[PDB]
């Protein structure tokens, strides 16, 4: 991007990382500029940056590595007194010793014992007692993104040692802390009444005039129809696999296999393994190309299918010939006694997927012109907020049943965390 707008909030963040002791949590909603400012922040700073994420797909997308692979953490709940097999390699140790800045994308998805373990490994590597071995830490993401649900034994082992299952519940945050900065500008659009509604929902202060609005979105006839510009936000995998499958059909189906070269982890693949399409299929772009004219999340309709090309008419009327795209799986290594990234593998596939319906999870980070929300009756805290944040307007939302005060379940650990640091200096943890 030679396009980047640099806002007051971004410069505020760069001012503070300048002081090598300042950890920073960079937060903001979808379309807030986070991953674009992330790239801005690697280039503009000194520092030896390392870029990690809690999942392969987020790692690939941010162009870093998983936290587990970088730091060699077995998957599972880890108490402070669970002992670590900590080796890595001579390249890895040496990379971590040169790291001047650790950047973690999608931090709200980091179950806090992960943070503490990373802290243990970096004290053992630097042979220091300082938090994170002194490494400076920038954290990116959206607080009100739902963290991954903790399994049976997970909450078991861990509840003994943690007051919470959110990333800021990490024990290290008793010994260190971080500033907070909200990215407030939504570049693709600006719609104040709707975003106010969303913020009243997430803070559990919400008018009867707002509840009137929410009951309007009900249209049961549309909700039950798959011929439309609307994408169904659904909670669970298989309702989507069923909607996207049933609309596809058996008629005139083209199938396109993924291609893997060298080393790619199965869970880091952010595209279809077997892409099954037909003229008429409804689809969504998986990558940003400003030159071709598509963004990740852009919806269109297939108008033709060839071997190496897929032609799609998007909702903005443009027509785009999609070609296979290649995703690169990297890792950190030494070249010339400098820590640099290197490609260890690849996966190649057309960057589209069937879009009649998308999970709440796979749609993390995205917004659409038109959406169909399913009030799932039984509800989990913050769920209604998530579902509605997938739209860009109020008037673009359609609910399958009335939206009721019942459906609004606050997450109070988040409102308080938010409430505190907002009055405590935009800082949380030990000063
Ligand atoms: N700093 C910026 N300046 C100008 N436009 C931006 C900026 N950041 C994002 N955009 C636009 O908004 C879109 C949102 O993408 P992204 O930066 O990934 O936001 P987020 O990750 O916070 O949802 C981009 O496709 C881009 O076209």
Please state, in angstroms and rounded to a whole number, the distance separating the CA atoms of residues 256 and 253: 10
Among candidates 324, 327, 225, which has minimal Cα distance to 282? 225
Please state, in angstroms and rounded to a whole number, the distance separating the CA atoms of residues 301 and 282: 5
Coil, strand or helix at 56: helix
In this structure, the residue with its CA closest to atom 17 of ligand 1 is 33
**Resolution of the coordinates, Å:** 2.4
CATH number for the region 8-187+413-429 comes to: 3.40.50.300
Experimentally, how was this structure solved? X-ray
Phi, then psi, of 104 in degrees rounded to 5:
-120, 115
- The atom number, within ligand 1, closest to the CA of 10 reads 1
Mutate to test the pocket of ligand 1, among 29, 30, 36 (most ligand atoms within 8 A of CB): 36
In this structure, the residue with its CA closest to atom 27 of ligand 1 is 188
DSSP for 135-174 reads -EEEEEE-TTSPPPPP-HHHHHHHHTT-S-SSGGG-THHH
| Sign of the four-CA dihedral 46, 48, 53, 58 | positive
Among candidates 62, 146, 107, 33, which has minimal Cα distance to 389? 146
Ligand 1 surroundings by CB, under 6 angstroms: 3-5, 28, 30-37, 187-188, 288, 295, 365
Contact 256, 277 (CB under 8 A): yes
Residues 6+ apart with CB under 8 A from 239: 357
Contact 244, 276 (CB under 8 A): no
* Distances, alpha carbon 150 to alpha carbons 158, 265, 302, 422, in Å: 10, 23, 39, 28
Residue with tokens 């002992």: 83
Contact 119, 84 (CB under 8 A): no
Interval between CA 5 and ligand 1 midpoint (Å):
9
């Amino acid at each position: 991007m030679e396009d980047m707008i640099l806002t007051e909030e971004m410069q505020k963040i760069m001012n503070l990382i300048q002081d090598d002791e300042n950890n920073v949590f960079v937060t903001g909603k979808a379309g807030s500029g986070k991953t674009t400012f992330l790239k801005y922040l690697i280039e503009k700073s000194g520092k030896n940056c390392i870029v990690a994420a809690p999942t392969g797909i987020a790692a690939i997308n941010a162009g870093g590595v998983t936290l587990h692979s970088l730091f060699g953490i077995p998957f599972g709940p880890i108490t402070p007194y669970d002992r670590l097999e900590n080796k890595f390699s001579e390249y890895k140790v040496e990379c971590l010793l040169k790291m001047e800045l650790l950047i973690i994308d999608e931090i709200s998805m980091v179950r806090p014992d992960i943070l503490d373990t990373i802290d243990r490994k970096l004290r053992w590597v630097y042979e220091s007692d300082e938090p994170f071995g002194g490494v400076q830490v920038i954290m990116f993401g959206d607080l009100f993104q739902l963290p991954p649900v903790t399994k049976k034994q997970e909450r078991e082992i861990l509840s003994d040692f943690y007051d919470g299952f959110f990333f800021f519940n990490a024990l290290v945050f008793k010994r260190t802390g971080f500033h907070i900065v909200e990215l407030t500008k939504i570049f693709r659009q600006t719609e104040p009444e709707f975003i106010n509604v969303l913020n009243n929902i997430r803070n559990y202060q919400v008018t009867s005039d707002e509840l009137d609005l929410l009951s309007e979105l009900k249209d049961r006839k549309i909700s039950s129809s798959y011929d439309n510009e609307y994408i169904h936000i659904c909670t669970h995998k298989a309702d989507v696999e069923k909607i996207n499958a049933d609309k596809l059909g058996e008629q005139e189906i083209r199938n396109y296999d993924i291609v893997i070269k060298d080393k790619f982890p199965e869970s880091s693949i952010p595209c279809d393994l077997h892409l099954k399409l037909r003229v008429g299929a409804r689809v969504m772009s998986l990558v940003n190309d400003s030159l071709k004219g598509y963004y990740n999340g852009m919806l269109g309709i297939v108008t033709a299918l060839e071997d190496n090309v897929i032609t799609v008419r998007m909702d903005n009327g443009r027509t785009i010939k999609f070609e296979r795209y290649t995703w690169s799986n990297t890792q950190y290594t030494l070249k010339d006694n400098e820590c640099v990234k290197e490609e260890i593998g690849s996966c190649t596939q057309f960057p589209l997927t069937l879009a009649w319906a998308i999970t709440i999870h796979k749609s993390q980070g995205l917004t659409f012109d038109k959406i169909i929300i399913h009030v799932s009756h039984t509800f989990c805290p913050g769920q209604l907020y998530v579902a509605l944040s997938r739209c860009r307007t109020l008037e673009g939302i359609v609910s399958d049943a009335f939206i009721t005060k019942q459906m609004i379940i606050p997450e109070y650990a988040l409102i308080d965390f938010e409430r505190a640091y907002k009055s405590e200096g935009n800082y949380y943890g030990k000063r």
